[PDB]
Amino acid sequence: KVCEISGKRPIVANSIQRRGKAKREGGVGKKTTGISKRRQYPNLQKVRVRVAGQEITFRVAASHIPKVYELVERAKGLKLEGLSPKEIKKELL
Template identity: 60%
Template structure:
């Protein structure tokens, strides 16, 4: 499957990108106003890594968090 970590299953998520204008009340303004909300996708940082598994080389797509955990263990 595309854009999914093969070790932990982490995949893309959908988030709201909020656009604001104005000056904050704490800074002496009248407050921040929301002028637009659009959905965006955040995808994990996947890297192709070759790992030795049971004597054979296996090529996996891992997120960087899993890569760090795999090298530490």
């Protein structure tokens, strides 16, 4: 599925199977022996984090994991409360 910070989502990618010897080498060259739809997912991972009273957890891409911590800090200026980790979350940017 989807990075809550970066918006990365799975994408369609063909997978190409080739045989043969590259022309760069001995040669004649590569022949494609099959091309198939498949998807590539992002590397989503769970990140729990303290913030205010409530805990709150993010589904986020490995690449953007720091950006979570970079949010938590920059939300020390916000006025944060209510048993609503829900709300805390939308309040993060």
